[PDB]
Amino acid sequence: NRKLAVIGAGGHGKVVAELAAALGTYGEIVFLDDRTQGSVNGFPVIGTTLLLENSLSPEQFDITVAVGNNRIRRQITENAAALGFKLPVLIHPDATVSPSAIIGQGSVVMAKAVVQAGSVLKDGVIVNTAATVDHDCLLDAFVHISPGAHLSGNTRIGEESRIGTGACSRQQTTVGSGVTAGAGAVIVCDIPDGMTVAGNPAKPL
């Protein structure tokens, strides 16, 4: 489509809108947001999220959901998909993505991020600024790999998990679903579903 609607005009949204602008492929980039009006960082906020169900045509707008919170991103993305909107994979020109990587709709790969050979990312993943996902990783739906986090080869990350800024994993580690790993967490073993961990090595909080 000629236009992109970025849902969420917070800080993450600003970065995503600049990423899209850098691609040079959209005729117009706009925000939907429920808390701010006017324009943000030079992009217009054309309305609230009610426009998605009520106004925007999937024949005119692509959608990206720029919400950091994984549960909310999931809810909005699934609603957009259900309404028939395209959810482009947005990859910054300064990211490096392997030609053998597979990346699901609605995912965003930020400046300086790397996704290596054989990795599989499901829907709505964020690989944030300078984060790396090495070969043969599996990142399930709505996972957030925060800025500067580094996953070793063969790391699996379960659905909706958040891996904090500057965190890392040892090779062949498995993180379950709904896991929170704090900034700087050093994941050296498998982490069960629903756990919050932090530290070096990462331990339950």
How far apart CA 8 and CA 34 sit, in angstroms, is 8
Say whether residue 186 binds a second copy (CB under 8 A).
Answer: yes
Nearer CB in complex with a second copy: 64/154: 154
Say whether residue 12 binds a second copy (CB under 8 A).
Answer: yes
Binding-site positions for acetyl-CoA read 144, 153, 162, 165, 170, 183, 203
Nearer CB in complex with a second copy: 7/52: 7
Q: What is the pattern of x (binds a second copy, CB under 8 A) and - over residues 25-54?
A: ----------------xx------------
Say whether residue 154 binds a second copy (CB under 8 A).
Answer: yes
Sheet holding 39-40, edge to edge: 39-40, 43-47, 28-32, 3-7, 61-65
150 is catalytic: no
How far apart CA 109 and CA 107 sit, in angstroms, is 7
Sorted by sequence, the CB contacts under 8 Å of residue 90 that are 6+ apart come out as 16, 19, 20, 23, 64, 107, 108, 109
Say whether residue 170 binds a second copy (CB under 8 A).
Answer: yes
Nearer CB in complex with a second copy: 56/187: 187
Say whether residue 180 binds a second copy (CB under 8 A).
Answer: no
| Binding-site ranges for a second copy (CB under 8 A) | 11-12, 14-15, 18, 41-42, 92, 94, 96, 98-100, 111-112, 114, 116-118, 128-130, 132, 134-136, 146-148, 150-154, 164-171, 182-184, 186-188, 198-201
As annotated, the active-site residues are: 135
